[PDB]
Design a protein around this ligand. Structure first.
Ligand SMILES: *C1=[C@](F)([C]N2[C]([C][N]C3=[C][C]=C(C(=O)[N][C]([C][C]C([O])=O)C([O])=O)[C]=[C]3)[C][N]C3=C2C(=O)[N]C([N])=N3)C(=O)[N]C(=O)N1[C]1[C][C]([O])[C]([C]OP([O])([O])=O)O1
Ligand SMILES: CN1c2c(nc(N)[nH]c2=O)NC[C@@H]1CNc1ccc(C(=O)N[C@@H](CCC(=O)O)C(=O)O)cc1
Ligand SMILES: *c1c(F)c(=O)[nH]c(=O)n1[C@H]1C[C@H](O)[C@@H](COP(=O)(O)O)O1
Lengths: 287, 287
């Protein structure tokens, strides 16, 4: 059956069997703890079709992670504004970060992926050669010892949490190789089913395609594991509309040239083919 | 119906559909990537019944983690020898720890859980007040903000990996509160289905009982998530024997006095009630 049906069944399960659970943002949710889905990456790319997903946002956000950036405004220069609210003067002030520049998210994904364990200063600092380049380590291990059971990139850093504008929603991922295929599992501690989760699915599928490309492997599965999987109260009616829509076959992702290192990928290297979504569904972000 | 059927079905699935995957130990495995099970902790305790599980081992190992120990000899002194092989002279030497005293596992679970980010020296150093006490922070957060979606204890420490005799198998866990119940999800990167996994299920169920007790909550679910779930080749025959056995109702776990802090729990504080396992099944550990 269509892989998108897993996402839709998760949404329906939360609507039907989820518990009312208040949250940080003051919005309110319906919530379930503990879910898992498996999205095949084999000649298909799991960009949801039951609404038009902002693929440019997914793509730019991942390249921004990869380059090690923790500056929301670097992403905003690309017309991708998704991290502006959590980097705003008001939001940073609400957390007591009145001294740092607007857009400075702290030692979040980019910094942990490429410099885990280095001493964070600000978003502009030069961290070259400092900390653990987990992303490069993952790639190197896949190339040289693919049976390894420790192929992990972890953005969760207990020491640095107090400095983060938002601790990583996508906390840890693990890679796996068998039969010439590269799979990835994400541990996502917290999943906004309406906004974040469709992005997260596409983002880690894309990352897996990227790493598969540079390691000469074929993409296998993306296994999506959720902790607190929730529907914000103001997404209930939009999601009930979405749930009635028939998925279209997933698109394909093409990489348009041979790229040798993870740092060399550019937006122009990717083409989504055969993407036929239902119309955009508006959903407001909980700050 | 019976929660143990999930474990048995996972084992059966790996036997039937798992792929042959070579491994670090040289033993070989049948392997699947990405599994999830949910063990209820409500008025019962998921200590497997299709073989007799070494409960004293589970209990002493967890208390050893909680006290921050990284010395296998301190666990061995309790009659629990399960960590001895990975702290042995030959094993340490194989990894390059030629000057390290036998028993010194490096900065593994106990250290990461109570002192994340501290500078490891050796297993006999005093780390009091150094690093992040993740376990106490989990407890405090459950008490002060049970809705929090960041209640995580993570042993995975990229910076410390090179010093570890064995990187954490149980890599990260997350706690969750709803309906007066405390639930726990474990992200286990690597699961030895025959030996480790039955211990891991009981261990995290036990930790959840302990924290629920301290925080005035009822145990909810233990959600078990696996990365590389595998059966060692020399466990195939023993597990096939196990698969022929019908589970008995799970036992209960009783806590025998009011305990106020996680560090005050002692072996004598616990009673497994109504445990009726099938006979012990011997399985050899892959070093
Ligand atoms: C988290 C995370 F990180 C995410 N996120 C971020 C941001 N992002 C975003 C934003 C916005 C958006 C939008 O808007 N979008 C679009 C539509 C859709 C499509 O198409 O796709 C447009 O606009 O167009 C997007 C994205 C940060 N923050 C946040 C987020 C989300 O999602 N949500 C919110 N509310 N916020 C990830 O990654 N994921 C997820 O899921 N996340 C979440 C979870 C929760 O809810 C939150 C956090 O909180 P805590 O409390 O848990 O910490 O988030
Ligand atoms: C999770 N661990 C683990 C590992 N290595 C492997 N291959 N598998 C594992 O599960 N290294 C580190 C740690 C060691 N834990 C363990 C846990 C149990 C046993 C074991 O031998 N248990 C037997 C008998 C124990 C007894 O009764 O004395 C059992 O039947 O459970 C060994 C190592
Ligand atoms: C290790 C443990 F410590 C544990 O708690 N549970 C486990 O299941 N294991 C297993 C997993 C694997 O068989 C070995 C560790 O080997 P690597 O994955 O590090 O090669 O022990």
């Amino acid at each position: 059956r269509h892989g998108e049906l897993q996402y839709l069944r998760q949404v329906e399960h939360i609507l039907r069997c989820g518990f009312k659970k208040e949250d940080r943002t003051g919005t309110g949710t319906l919530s379930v703890f503990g879910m898992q889905a498996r999205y095949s990456l084999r000649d298909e790319f799991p960009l949801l079709t039951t609404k038009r997903v902002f693929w440019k946002g997914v793509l730019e956000e991942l390249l921004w992670f990869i380059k090690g950036s923790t500056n929301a405004k670097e992403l905003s220069s690309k017309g991708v504004r998704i991290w502006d609210a959590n980097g705003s003067r008001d939001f940073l002030d609400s957390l007591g970060f009145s001294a740092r520049q607007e857009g400075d998210l702290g030692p979040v994904y980019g910094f942990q992926w490429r410099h885990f364990g280095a001493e964070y200063k600000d978003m502009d600092s030069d961290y070259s050669g400092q900390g653990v380049d987990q992303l490069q380590k993952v790639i190197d291990t896949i190339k040289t010892n693919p049976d390894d059971r420790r192929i992990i990139m972890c953005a969760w850093n207990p020491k640095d949490l107090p400095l983060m504008a938002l601790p990583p929603c996508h906390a840890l991922c693990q890679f796996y190789v068998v039969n010439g295929e590269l799979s990835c599992q994400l541990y996502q501690r917290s999943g906004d089913m309406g906004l974040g989760v469709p992005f997260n699915i596409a983002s880690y599928a894309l990352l897996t395609y990227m790493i598969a490309h540079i390691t000469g492997l074929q993409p296998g599965d993306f296994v999506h594991t959720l902790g607190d999987a929730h529907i914000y109260l103001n997404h209930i009616e939009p999601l009930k509309i979405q749930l009635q829509r028939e998925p279209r076959p997933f698109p394909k992702l093409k990489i348009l040239r041979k790229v040798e290192t993870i740092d060399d990928f550019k937006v122009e290297d990717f083409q989504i083919e055969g993407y036929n979504p239902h119309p955009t569904i508006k959903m407001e972000m909980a700050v």
